[PDB]
Every structure is written in structure tokens, then in C-alpha cells.
Amino acid sequence: KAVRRARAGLKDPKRPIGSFIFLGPTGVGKTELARALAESMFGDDDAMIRVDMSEFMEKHAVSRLVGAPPGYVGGQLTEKVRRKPYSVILFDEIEKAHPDVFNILLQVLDDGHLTDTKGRTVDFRNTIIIMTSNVGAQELQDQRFAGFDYETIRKTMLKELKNSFRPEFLNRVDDIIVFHKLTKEELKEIVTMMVNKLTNRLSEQNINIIVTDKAKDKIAEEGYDPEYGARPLIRAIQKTIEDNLSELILDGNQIEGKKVTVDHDGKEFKYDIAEQ
Amino acid sequence: KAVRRARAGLKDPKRPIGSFIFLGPTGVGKTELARALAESMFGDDDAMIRVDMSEFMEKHAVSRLVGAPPGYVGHDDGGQLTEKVRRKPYSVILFDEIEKAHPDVFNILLQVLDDGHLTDTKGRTVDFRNTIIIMTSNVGAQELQDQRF
Amino acid sequence: NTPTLDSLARDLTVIAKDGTLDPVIGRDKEITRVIEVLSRRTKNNPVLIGEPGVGKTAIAEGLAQAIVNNEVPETLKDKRVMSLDMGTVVAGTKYRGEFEERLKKVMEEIQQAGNVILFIDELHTLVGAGGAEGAIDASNILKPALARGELQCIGATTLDEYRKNIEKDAALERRFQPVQVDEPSVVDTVAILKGLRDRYEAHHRINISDEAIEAAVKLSNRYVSDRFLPDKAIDLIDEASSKVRLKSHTTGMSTSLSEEDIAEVIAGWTGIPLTKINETESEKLLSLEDTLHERVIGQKDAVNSISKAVRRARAGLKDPKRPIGSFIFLGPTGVGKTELARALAESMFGDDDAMIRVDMSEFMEKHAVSRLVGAPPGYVGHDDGGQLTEKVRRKPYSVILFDEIEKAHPDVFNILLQVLDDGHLTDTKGRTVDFRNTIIIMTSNVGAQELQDQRF
Amino acid sequence: NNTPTLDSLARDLTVIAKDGTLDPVIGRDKEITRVIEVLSRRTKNNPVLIGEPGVGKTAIAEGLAQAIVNNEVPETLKDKRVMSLDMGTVVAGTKYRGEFEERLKKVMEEIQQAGNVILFIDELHTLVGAGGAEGAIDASNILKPALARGELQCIGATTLDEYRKNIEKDAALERRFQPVQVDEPSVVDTVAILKGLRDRYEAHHRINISDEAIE
Amino acid sequence: DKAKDKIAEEGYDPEYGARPLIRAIQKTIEDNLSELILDGNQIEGKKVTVDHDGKEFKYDIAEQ
Amino acid sequence: ILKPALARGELQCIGATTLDEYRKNIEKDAALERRFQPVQVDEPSVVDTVAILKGLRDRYEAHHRINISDEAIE
Ligand SMILES: Nc1ncnc2c1ncn2[C@@H]1O[C@H](COP(=O)(O)OP(=O)(O)OP(O)(O)=S)[C@@H](O)[C@H]1O
Ligand SMILES: Nc1ncnc2c1ncn2[C@@H]1O[C@H](COP(=O)(O)OP(=O)(O)OP(O)(O)=S)[C@@H](O)[C@H]1O
Ligand SMILES: Nc1ncnc2c1ncn2[C@@H]1O[C@H](COP(=O)(O)OP(=O)(O)OP(O)(O)=S)[C@@H](O)[C@H]1O
Ligand SMILES: Nc1ncnc2c1ncn2[C@@H]1O[C@H](COP(=O)(O)OP(=O)(O)OP(O)(O)=S)[C@@H](O)[C@H]1O
Ligand SMILES: Nc1ncnc2c1ncn2[C@@H]1O[C@H](COP(=O)(O)OP(=O)(O)OP(O)(O)=S)[C@@H](O)[C@H]1O
Ligand SMILES: [Mg+2]
Ligand SMILES: [Mg+2]
Ligand SMILES: [Mg+2]
Ligand SMILES: [Mg+2]
């Protein structure tokens, strides 16, 4: 919707295309969604401007954004945005910065302007700003009921965001989206996507793979862990698919140019080998 | 009333037209008021000399206001704010969100509010006596939110 | 005629007729922008902007070829491309007014000829060039002519030298039009190399195969992070060709490049083991657990996991987007885990000192994080850069040991998060260091004491 | 020879090698091979020798000069001249505008006309910013055009930290040199080195040096 | 006026002042106009009237 | 050399420079600064810019050999 408003010309000239906080559990596609947006707008993930806020644990690191004061030894963000004014900016995992680094963001969000230590103004008015976070996720496991869902999770995360960030910052964001924890069906679709991307990475090595739905479902149930989202699926793929193929191709290269089929027989994975 | 009092000629020559702290809850047009004043006085918002104090968090960033310290590389250039004011002595100056600056920045502002003069690090003195100085803040909003009854 | 200019400047048009200039491929959009700007009325001065090695000087050479080949609109069908090194202009102007007179003469000759397109490559040199205690620099002499359309002046410079030098002089900046030369894509780079190929075959006296072109582009794009695509792919093809020449020439005849001749060069540059797995290396990798148990007794599960990650990287199944492995080793004191990290480093490099080591017990204060990534711009020691970033950049295939992780301030590991997920860490200069080929081992003994002071 | 100004600014290492006064270079066959591979390149055929202080980089360039004299290099190099150029010598006596740019331009023309010269610039990090700054054009900017199209075959040596501090600040200059990593030799390699150098020290100190003294 | 009043209550949030009104204007007015104008340029040169019926906003297109 | 004549009124000398180069060069020599009177040329408005472009139009049409519409100016 924000991208369409920008392309329709309805977007207020004096403001960025959008500013979004992506909030949720760990391992839920919010940084992946930011990269997917960058790809959909520019054809590659590399076109995203990225700022990994954990580098900014201490206030004075803000000089990376706007440069060193006049006459002091030695801005990165200002130069990159001035070079590509139509771009996606990702401030990943905002809560790990020093709380008041984002005081610099305020003028960006309200005006779409930021001033460079050379006295030069850069206009973020055509950028999209995305800020991933997972405040509250630690508190969600500190919490235990000495006593006898989604909306309560949403509310407590939003409250912890209210605690961590000053009110005049949160007031400038155009939208604050909480991400749903993944369902097991969604995890099975993610397994299908990952297996596709593995297959067509390996195919240009001339290693041809197929994985049956039974095998993918076994992987999806092996990697299931709700508190960790999709990441434990990667580890399951590494253990099951990649380890045994690596053993085969190292042990006499017995796979190059052949076809490998992975299926699970109900007891264990099997790695049948055949010609095309 | 401050604008009208200055245009009537009754303003103290030694002082700026006005200095005002705008304070209160977020999203209440205290920045928009400064913008509207700038438009009413000059016909465009962009005539406002806007300074975003949230860049001045570290002590040494004050070099942007009055130039690099003596012997530093940019020392001959003078300050960016001093030169913008010297170039346009009738102007609205907005110090947005003052409380986010390092405390040391207000020591520079003191002589501006006291004599209407700012000494650039070159030693040149810039006269603010015809400017309007507006400072916005929202100190206490986090103290307001943790007022539980 | 232009008798001073002819002595000061190289004529690229005659050199293009001679034919020594290498061919330009695919850059039709940039050449079109250059033609559009040159056909302007008032400030027909394109400046080609981009990274080092992306091809800007090649764009100017391709424009000289296009003029010679009469592929240009009629207004350019008889134009001279003159490449004016400002060094040659400044050279020998010992006395007052000699530089100003020489450059004024050059401008007069350009004006009277009218058919010259000047090419001031390295345009950032033009600011202050020829200045002195009372001289007038080249920029202030050229400013009048650049703004009346009398000169047609192509320039080229890096983005950083543009910002640093000629965005200082805001009056000079106005007079040039930046044509952004982007880094070409993989497929564009393949086409570029195929077009250049004949020039390198004629030098090295070898056949350069298409799959070698594809290997060199893919590998140099994946593993050479400091340099940009066309230059570094040409570099990799040129060194692989030189290598196979040298090896065959000193004691069939139609020697041909191959993907392995490229892998050997890229492995020589980076130290990453990219050459084909021979049987000795494979037998060593398969017996890796046995080699690690020569120094670590027990701990079978850890040895297994480490060896499987090493095999998974050497096979080529590792996700390109992520480090080879990240491991936490957790357990009681005096039990193998640091010894296992050292055994792994020895098994991979023949020495324990090849391991990058970070003792987290000295990151007890949060602000110590500046050791990993450097001081912010403006603070003392900013020039020195990050110690971990420099060490990993200098040896991208290395074991990194983060020792005694629980003793560091809890926040300090937030810097690791991007390393573990992307395999990137950003140096405080803004340089990106890729950890994608490192193994990261973290060691801890949390809980292990509680497992003894638990008394039910 | 036909290069009358270069021969006054530089030292001909090839003749000094033919006079046998350069100490012998032992065991560095892989680095020498890499240098030969880079010099045989078509375009950016300039190696830069990178390593720690005292690992033996200048000794690599001298081993190359001796390889030239021994004609054991390929025919493409079999008659090259290695000329060590001190940048502090080039800037000597150049007070007036354009005098340094003229000197280095004439040097470059002489190199191009002779074609049989390999330039060696030890301590290459001095190259950037050499030649002053008050309206001067420094050596790096003068040489960048030639270094990228094969006219100059140039060998550099510098420490890792001076490379980082100086060369990589000018990434356009960085692109033009290929880093040849001069690793520290092993213990047994250093034993072989010292047993090779023995004769040169025995003659100077007029004493025998036992093997177990080397060990 | 009924549309303006509905926007003024959907955007009401007293701790955040006027800014949530902007988000409300964006969601209600600008989303649907951007859909209309991107879906076949059907707004250009025509008049649009926005009202609220007590269930939802309606976006009626007419000639001038 | 010129300070005497500029202060006497011997030369009717118009000059032009940017704000930055005025501040950097000729405000240092405060005696020379005194001899000149600054006329600030402000940036023209949007509508003034439209008028300027409609005035220049003939010169660009005759160069490019095309017609330039008013709405293209706007
Ligand atoms: N909903 C999803 N759809 C598809 N892939 C997903 C999804 N969630 C996670 N993934 C995959 O899981 C991996 C990690 O996803 P991320 O988006 O980085 O998790 P994240 O929570 O956004 O990371 P943070 O914000 O830095 S903690 C990637 O390989 C994604 O492709
Ligand atoms: N009282 C008001 N009257 C009119 N418009 C207002 C008012 N308050 C806010 N606005 C509008 O809502 C937006 C935000 O107003 P601002 O004036 O920027 O809020 P602000 O509180 O002044 O900013 P702060 O203090 O730095 S968070 C602008 O588009 C204003 O036009
Ligand atoms: N489109 C192209 N077609 C053919 N060769 C190309 C092309 N683009 C780049 N090259 C080659 O890339 C190499 C380096 O390109 P250059 O244009 O010389 O570098 P550059 O961009 O001028 O870098 P600097 O820093 O400005 S000297 C040369 O060998 C060119 O032949
Ligand atoms: N399983 C083992 N096999 C062989 N040597 C071992 C083993 N465990 C410990 N050692 C030796 O004991 C010494 C100490 O081993 P360490 O690995 O440093 O202990 P540690 O577990 O690292 O202690 P912490 O957890 O870092 S406090 C070394 O000399 C090791 O060679
Ligand atoms: N491979 C070698 N063969 C023979 N002698 C060597 C070798 N390596 C080093 N040496 C000797 O050890 C010393 C090394 O000095 P250098 O070669 O100048 O080292 P360096 O790295 O060039 O030091 P800098 O950087 O120039 S200060 C000299 O006395 C050399 O003769
Ligand atoms: Mg994130
Ligand atoms: Mg404000
Ligand atoms: Mg060039
Ligand atoms: Mg040396």
C-alpha cells in the first residue's frame, strides 16, 4: 500500500514513502521481508541500504551516520542515500542500539531531511525506512504464570516497545506491524521453498537433486520448534540433506552428473542414486 | 505580541526579538507554529534557519555552530550557524528538541540570549539581535507515561 | 590546427584508427547519455562517475571508437578526442604566467578548431592544478569557457574523489554532468570478457575457453570483495593465462585455459581451498575425526560436528550467504573445548597460531566493542581500524575463537549477530568484511559450576 | 644508456647483481614465480610485495634481478633492466612549479622509449602524496595513467600496515597493484637462508660460523 | 462531513496528538485513490466524492 | 595595486563571486572587502523561473531544432 501510494503520487511530498517497524518473535521473515522488498523494487537484495544497529551500542557511534564534526579526523548513510535517493533503508534490530541514537532519525521521519556534518542536507523523501526489532521476546520467556493466543502477545510486545522507545519517536512511524508466529503449515511451505533454492543452487554445480514430499515433511517435523521460527529448519536441512551429499561427493565424487533422490522410508532418510 | 512589539520599535536594542521554549505533549503543533511564523514573516517555510539539536549529542559537535577549535583544520571557515545568521540577520531560528543536545551547547546559547551576540571561533561576533529564537522540547513525556495513579 | 594541444595531449581518435584500443561492449546506455550531454547547448560536459575499475576510461575510449566508426550523430562525425593529462600541462611552467599562458593558448586553439572534444581523465586533479603563491589554478581559468559551451570536456573520476575534491568547488561542480557508470552485471561481465578475449589470446598465445570465462566471473564475484566486477574478472583471466603460459613454456601445443587454472589463482589470492579435491586431500578430510582425536580425547560429538561442517564447506554445499559454521562449546573447566578449537586450527593450517583468537574476558566493559570494529569517525585511533575486521580481511579462510563468552558484557555479542546471520561485519570506516569463509567457535562454562553446587 | 636522466635518479640493480655484490636469495621460488607471473600479465602487470618488516621483500626484488642476470627467467624478461627508484631522490631539488612533474614525465618517456626497463619502487607507500601539494600533482596521479595500460612494469614493496594506511586510501591506485604475500619463512627455511648467507659474514668478520650456531 | 468525522474518530488517540490523523488520512483516502488510479487510470480527469455510510467509506466517480 | 583606485572611485568595477569564495578569499583582506558593495542575487522563485525559461526558449529551440511546449517548461 505504501509503495502504491508513492507511485500514484498521492504520497505527501514532505515525507518518506514509508517508515515501518517490523516487530515479532525471532526467526520470522521480517528481515527477510525487507530484503524481499529491496529485491522486488531493484532486482537484487544488494541494492538495499543496510545499517546494523548493533554496531551502535554506544551513543558516539552516531558519527558514522552523519560524519565527524568539522576539523576532527574524518557521512556513510548520508552519502549512500544522496547517491541513491530512491532506495530501501533497513535499520535492523533497532533495540540493540543505544536508546538515543534514533534521536537522529526523528528529523528524517518527520521532514525526510537529515543534515550532513559538512552542512549539507540529504533528502530521504523518496526512501523507504524499515526497522526490524524483537523487543519483548526475552520478556515473553521470563514470564511464567504462578497461576492456574496472539492478542495478548501483540499487546505486551507493543507495551515493551512503548517502554524502550521515547513517545515522540513512535509517533512518527507510519505503521507498527507485529509478526505472527509461524504455523506448521507455513513451516512446511518454507521447507518447500528452501529445498527448491537448495536444488537450483546445486543444479548449476551439475548436482541434480529431488526431494519427495515425505522427506520434506519429515524434515519439517524434525525442525519444528515454535520459539525459534524458521531458523531450525536450516539446521535440519544441513544435517539431513547436506551432510550425506557431502560425504558422497567427497567419497570418490560418486555423485557428479548423476541424479540423487532423497526420501524417508518411515525409519530413516535414504539417498538413492540414478542416471537422468 | 513579541513580533508586533519588535516591529513597533519598542524592543530592547541589546536583545533578540524573542526567545521562546515551546514545551508540551508530542504532536501538538509547536514545530508547526514555528513553521507558520516563518511563512507569515517571509512567505516560505524554507526561510527558517532550522537547527536539529539531535545531531549535537556529543560535546565536540558544537564546532558546527561556531567553527573548529583554534588550530584545527577548518578553523578559518567559521561556523555554519554563525555564517547563516550573519548572511540573514532578520530570520527565525528554530532549535528543535533542545534537550537532546549535549549540555555544553547551551553555554554557547547563553551569550546569544544575554547579549544577542555570538562569538565565532575566529573571534568575529555575529549579531542575533534581530532574530527570533524558538526552542522546542518535550522533556518529561517519559515521566508523564510512568505517572501511574 | 592546434599545435600546442597536439604536443600536450594524446589524440585518442588517431589511436583508435591505429587500433590498439581495446573494444567496448554493452555500454550503450552510458555512451548514449554521453552523446546526449555532448549535444547539449550550454554545458555539454559529461563527467563519468563510478567505482574504480568499472570502465569509465573504457567509456571514453569507446566514444573515440564510435566517432572513428561513424556510429555517432552527424554533429560528431568529425570530432577529435584529445586526452589531456594535467600533469603534462603543469610540467615545465617554472615562471609566473607560464601555466596561465599555456592553458589560455590551449583554450584559444580549442575554440578556433571547434572540432575537438577534450578528455580530462582524472578530473579531480583539475582543482588547484598549477596553483602557487600567486598563480591562478586550472579550474578558475577553465570556468568561463565551460559555462559558455566553448569547451567540450569529458571527465572521469571515482565517486570518492568527486565528493572529496570537486564538490568542494561548487562552481566547478555545476559545469559538469555526472554520468553514473554502474558496476556491470555477471552476464554483462561475461560478454565483456568474451569481447576482450581475442586481445588476451594474442598476448598469451593460448586458447581461453568459455567455461573459464564463466568460472572466472563467478569466482571473482563470490570471493574477491575489495574490487569491482570487470577489472577483477579480467585480472583473474589474465593471471590464469600468464600462469599456464609460464608453466608450459619452461621445460598438446594448443594449451587451453580451464576452471582449475582459475581456481588455482583465486586460491592463491585468498587462501580459500577452491582447487579440485584430489585424493590426498579427500582422504585427509575423511580421516579428519581421527586427526582431531590425536589431540582431543573423547568429546566425540563435538569432533563429529566440527568435521561435518568442514566437510560440508569443502564439498561446496555450504550456503554462500553464511559462515562455514558457528559453534558454542559448553561444559566443565579443563575439558577439551579450547584444545579442540586449537586442534581444528592445526588440522586446517598446520599451526595453532593461524587461529584468530579473541579472549572475551577482556570485553567486560561494553565500550570495549571498539576493539572489534574501531573507533567512530572523529575519535582518537579511528585511522587504525578494527583489529578483528583487519585480521579476518587479511585471512578470510580462518578459524575464529571467541573464548569464555559468558565473561564479556552481555551486549557485546550483539555485534556477532550480523556475522552469524549474513557473514558480514562493517568496519567503522564503512568497509564490509565478509566472514562467509570463517569457522566461529565460542566456548563457555555457564551452569557447569551449578551442576556441582546443586545438592538436593 | 639512452635513458640519461633515469640512470641518474635510480640504481641499476641488474648490474649490481652482475657484480655479485647483492647477497644471494635462497628458497623464495614461489614468490619469485608469482612475481614473474604478474610481470608477464598483459595489462596491470605490476606486483607489490606485501609482508611484515624484515621478512625479505627487498630480497625478493634482488633475487629477481639476479634471476635476470642468470638468464633463468623467461625470454620476455631475459634482458630487462631492474631500476630501483627512490622517490625521495626524484623530489630532490624541485622548488619551482612543474619541475617535479617535468622530471617524472621525462623519466616516464624514457621508460616508454626504452621498453626494456622494470621499475622497482621499494617502500611504495611513499608514492602517494610525493611531490608536494601547493598546486603540484603528486606522483600517484602522474603514474596512474601509465600503470593501468602496461607501459610501466613496476615492482613495489611495502609493509601491510603502510599499505593499509596509504595505498588503500586511494582505491584507484590500489587497483593497479597485485599483492604478492611474502610470508615469514619457517624455521628450517631460515636455517637454509643462514647457511646460504654464511660465506658473506665469515668473510666480513673473518671467523668461522658453525652449523650449530645457526641452529 | 460524515467522512471527515469518521476519520477524526478512527484517528483519535489523545497521547499522540494530531499525527495519527495523518495515518488515518493515508489509510482511508490515499489507499483507495491509489488503487483506483493504478487500476487503469480511471480517476484521471474525473471527479471523486468520498462519503461514509455508517458501514464503510464509499468512493464514487463522476464527471465534473 | 588596485586598492587605491577602488577606494577613490577611479574604477567602476563590477565583480561576481559565490558566498563561499567571498567569505574564504576576500573577507580575509578586510581592507579590500570594505572597497566592494555586495549585491545579493537571490535564487528566483518558481514563477520567475518559468518566465526566465519562456524568455530563453527561442535560443534552445533554434539550437536543437525542436518545439518546446509551455507545459514542458512547467
Ligand atoms: N515467513 C517466512 N517465509 C519465508 N522464509 C522465512 C520466513 N521466516 C523466516 N524465513 C527464513 O528464515 C531465515 C531467517 O529469517 P529472518 O527474516 O532473518 O528472521 P528475522 O526474525 O527477520 O531475523 P531478525 O529480525 O534479525 S531476529 C531466512 O533464511 C528466511 O528465508
Ligand atoms: N495544533 C495543531 N494545529 C494544526 N496542525 C497541527 C497541530 N498539531 C499538529 N499538527 C499537524 O500535524 C503534524 C505534526 O505537527 P508538529 O507540529 O510537527 O508536531 P510537534 O509536536 O510540533 O513536533 P514535535 O514537538 O517535535 S514531536 C504536522 O503536519 C502539523 O501540520
Ligand atoms: N564495457 C567494457 N568493455 C570492455 N572492456 C571493459 C569494459 N569496461 C571495462 N573494461 C575493462 O576494464 C579495465 C579497467 O577499466 P578502466 O576504464 O581502465 O578503469 P577505470 O574505470 O578508468 O578506473 P579508474 O580508477 O577511473 S583509472 C580495462 O582493461 C578495460 O578494458
Ligand atoms: N579431552 C582432552 N584431551 C586432550 N587433552 C585435553 C583434554 N582436556 C583437556 N586437555 C588438556 O588440558 C589442558 C587444558 O585444556 P583446555 O582445553 O584449556 O581446558 P578448557 O576446557 O579450555 O578450560 P576452560 O573451559 O576454557 S576454563 C591442555 O593442555 C589440553 O591439552
Ligand atoms: N630468502 C632470503 N634469501 C636470502 N637472504 C634473505 C632472504 N630473506 C631475507 N634475507 C636477508 O634478511 C634481511 C632481510 O631484509 P629485507 O629483505 O630488506 O627485509 P624487508 O622486508 O625488505 O625489510 P624492509 O621492509 O625493506 S625495512 C637481509 O639481510 C636479507 O639479505
Ligand atoms: Mg533484523
Ligand atoms: Mg520539532
Ligand atoms: Mg580514467
Ligand atoms: Mg624495502
From Swiss-Prot, chain A:
Residues 1-137 are annotated as: II. Coiled coil: none annotated. It comes from the Bacteria. Transmembrane segments: none annotated. Disulfide bonds: none annotated. Induction: By heat shock. Transcriptionally regulated by CtsR. Up-regulated by heavy metals such as Cu(2+) and Cd(2+), but Zn(2+) and Co(2+) have no effect. Forms part of an operon with ctsR, mcsA and mcsB. ATP binds at residues 24-31. May interact with ClpP. Required for growth at high temperatures, probably by acting as a chaperone during heat shock and targeting heat-denatured proteins for degradation by ClpP. Required for biofilm formation. May act as a chaperone regulating CtsR activity. Belongs to the ClpA/ClpB family. ClpC subfamily. This is ATP-dependent Clp protease ATP-binding subunit ClpC. It comes from Staphylococcus aureus (strain NCTC 8325 / PS 47). The gene is clpC.
